[PDB]
Amino acid sequence: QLHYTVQEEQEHGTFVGNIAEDLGLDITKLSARGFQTVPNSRTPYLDLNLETGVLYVNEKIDREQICKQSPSCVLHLEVFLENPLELFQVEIEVLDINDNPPSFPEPDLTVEISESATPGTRFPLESAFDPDVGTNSLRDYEITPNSYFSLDVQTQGDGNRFAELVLEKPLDREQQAVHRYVLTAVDGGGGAGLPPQQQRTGTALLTIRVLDSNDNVPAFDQPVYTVSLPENSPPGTLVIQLNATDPDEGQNGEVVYSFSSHISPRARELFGLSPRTGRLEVSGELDYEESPVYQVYVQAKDLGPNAVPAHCKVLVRVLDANDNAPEISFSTVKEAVSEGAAPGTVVALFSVTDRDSEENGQVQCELLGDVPFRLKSSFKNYYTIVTEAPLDREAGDSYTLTVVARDRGEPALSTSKSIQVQVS
Ligand SMILES: *[C@@H]1O[C@H](CO[C@@H]2O[C@@H](C)[C@@H](O)[C@@H](O)[C@@H]2O)[C@@H](O[C@@H]2O[C@H](CO)[C@@H](O)[C@H](O)[C@H]2NC(C)=O)[C@H](O)[C@H]1NC(C)=O
Ligand SMILES: *[C@H]1O[C@H](CO)[C@@H](O)[C@H](O)[C@@H]1O
Ligand SMILES: *[C@H]1O[C@H](CO)[C@@H](O)[C@H](O)[C@@H]1O
Ligand SMILES: [Ca+2]
Ligand SMILES: [Ca+2]
Ligand SMILES: [Ca+2]
Ligand SMILES: [Ca+2]
Ligand SMILES: [Ca+2]
Ligand SMILES: [Ca+2]
Ligand SMILES: [Ca+2]
Ligand SMILES: [Ca+2]
Ligand SMILES: [Ca+2]
């Protein structure tokens, strides 16, 4: 049983083996003996010269086609002579050359990884396939140098190899949502009398899409905000536009605002908070004389799973306006004054109050008319009405004295009160 070898991809007419010689047959007797190829073992890849006994390549041999990824490739030829009958078997071994690169099944790979994946986690890649065999097949994978991912490769047999990405450090979608790298696969070309083989290489783009986790908590730029507003500010008045930022994606990053449970029942009445905009506004009557300040406790919380609430406090200081007029109150009024009352004779006592504060609560007083009475004051806001001259029971019998109390706000407010006095 003769044994020959032939490189795949040799051109037509290449020498394969001298069958006549290696069997001891003189070429001069070949024709007489009916030197011929057995019918079943004919192959389009081999020509046998029957006059010389020499085997030549006929059609070029592609090992990948006849033998796929088999580790061994052997064409079986059989020849025979007649008179006597003699049958000879011939095995022709086809040697693989490195005429194919590793190849990926698609030019762009995409791998999706949660930004909360732990370092050490592995993500499989689509493997490249190299149709050559043995050392000419796939040998290793490589990735663009980078600090986030390395490669792990293992043997699958039949010259195949499988790679995974190995996560080397945490990802942060909020810092970079997509990583792009170049993936490469090289075979092992670089042995039964073969000429030098060169290494071949295949390529694929690799896209890492980083999936969002709800790992950012909404954030107010301050823990307390202070706002001053005039009392009687009308409903709808803006207090403050809160903003609790959240860089996450989707519902993870959508923030809704509401009142914390610690909020006073009065603040809940007087203020209203837009759940989606964070707009805080007045919805009731702010009355300084009721309270100069309110504490609004707000919470913000995103709409994702495992959301964590954030908190801030709005201090609403109320500013006093001049919305109360002075109050006059008489404590004693002698309706009758004697005719000859000397000047300075006291006729009435009274006091004034104003529910406002500062200038808005400061009161000045005047006596109206051209009557012969004068105002005196011993202490702030306490007054007396005295006479100023002698009198007359008939010319001036009864007198109406009216006091006007005026505060010092803008616009000012004033009040009046009258008393009836008569000469005995
Ligand atoms: C609420 O704030 C956002 C974001 O503001 C930026 O990021 C914060 C962390 C903080 O550092 C701010 O000072 C930053 O300006 C506002 O939206 C952004 O506004 C900036 C300019 O103000 C603009 O350049 C960006 O493109 C905006 N981006 C987005 C996604 O909106 C937003 O307008 C604020 N809302 C209100 C009601 O004030
Ligand atoms: C294929 O190409 C790679 C580079 O992309 C080489 O490293 C390799 O030797 C082969 O030439
Ligand atoms: C695939 O394509 C890349 C281009 O980035 C080469 O480096 C590689 O050798 C193969 O040709
Ligand atoms: Ca081939
Ligand atoms: Ca080959
Ligand atoms: Ca190859
Ligand atoms: Ca993150
Ligand atoms: Ca969030
Ligand atoms: Ca996130
Ligand atoms: Ca008031
Ligand atoms: Ca007031
Ligand atoms: Ca007042």
Extended beta strands in 115-177, E state: 122-124, 138-143, 149-157, 160-167
Tell how far the Cα of 252 is from the centroid of ligand 7, in angstroms: 11
CATH no. of 100-213: 2.60.40.60
Q: If DSSP codes are grouped into helix, strand and coil, which group holds residue 97?
A: coil
Alpha helices in 168-283 (DSSP H): 265-270
Contact 124, 38 (CB under 8 A): no
**Which numbered atom of ligand 1 lies nearest the CA of 241?**
37
> Which residue's C-alpha comes closest to atom 4 of ligand 2?
201
Letter string b/e over residues 260-288, b meaning 16 or more CB atoms within 10 A of that residue's CB? eeebeeebeebbbbeeeebebbbeeebeb
Q: Determine the residue of 181, 203, 205, 206 to mutate for testing ligand 3's pocket, defined as the one with the most ligand atoms within 8 A of the Cβ atom.
A: 203
d(CA 281, CA 259): 13
Q: If DSSP codes are grouped into helix, strand and coil, which group holds residue 1?
A: coil
Cα dihedral value 242, 243, 249, 255, nearest 10: -10
d(CA 174, CA 177): 7
Identify residue 367 by its one-letter amino acid code. L
What is the domain partition of the chain in residue ranges? 1-99, 100-213, 214-322, 323-424
CATH topology of domain 323-424: Immunoglobulin-like (2.60.40)
Q: If DSSP codes are grouped into helix, strand and coil, which group holds residue 252?
A: helix
- Overall resolution, Å: 2.3
Contact 78, 116 (CB under 8 A): no
Three-state SS for 287-305 is CCCCCCEEEEEEEEEECCC
Whether 100-213 and 323-424 share one fold: the answer is yes
Please give the structure tokens belonging to residue 129.
């396939």
Secondary element (H or E) of residue 112: strand 108-114
Q: Is the peptide bond before 84 cis (omega within 30 degrees of 0)?
A: yes
C-alpha neighbours within 13 Å on the C-beta side of residue 208:
29
**What is the number of other CB atoms lying within 10 angstroms of the CB of residue 201?**
13
> Which residue's C-alpha comes closest to atom 6 of ligand 3?
203
The neighbouring-strand residues paired with 420 are: 400
d(CA 404, CA 402): 7
**DSSP secondary-structure letter at 103?**
B
Residues in the chain: 424
Please give the structure tokens belonging to residue 379.
């202490």
Tell how far the Cα of 191 is from the centroid of ligand 6, in angstroms: 15
Tell how far the Cα of 137 is from the centroid of ligand 4, in angstroms: 12
Who's near 139: CB < 8 A, 6+ residues apart?
161, 186, 187, 188
Contact 265, 224 (CB under 8 A): no
Q: How far apart, in Å, are the Cα atoms of 27 and each of 34, 79, 81, 127?
A: 12, 15, 12, 54
Q: For domain 214-322, give its CATH number from 3.30.930.10, 1.20.120.450, 2.60.120.330, 2.60.40.60.
A: 2.60.40.60
Contact 125, 163 (CB under 8 A): yes
Tell how far the Cα of 168 is from the centroid of ligand 2, in angstroms: 25
Q: How far apart, in Å, are the Cα atoms of 403 and each of 146, 352, 410?
A: 91, 10, 21
The neighbouring-strand residues paired with 112 are: 209
The dihedrals phi and psi of 194, each to the nearest 5 degrees, come to: -90, 150
Provide residues with CB under 6 Å of ligand 3: 182, 184, 201-203
**What is the number of other CB atoms lying within 10 angstroms of the CB of residue 91?**
14
Q: How far apart, in Å, are the Cα atoms of 239 and each of 266, 277, 280?
A: 16, 13, 5
Q: Determine the residue of 138, 140, 201, 206 to mutate for testing ligand 3's pocket, defined as the one with the most ligand atoms within 8 A of the Cβ atom.
A: 201
Please give the structure tokens belonging to residue 7.
């490189």
d(CA 339, CA 373): 14
Tell how far the Cα of 290 is from the centroid of ligand 1, in angstroms: 37
Q: Determine the residue of 184, 187, 203, 205 to mutate for testing ligand 2's pocket, defined as the one with the most ligand atoms within 8 A of the Cβ atom.
A: 184
Identify residue 28 by its one-letter amino acid code. T
The neighbouring-strand residues paired with 96 are: none
The reply to whether ligand 1 has any atom less than 6 angstroms from the CB of 241 is yes
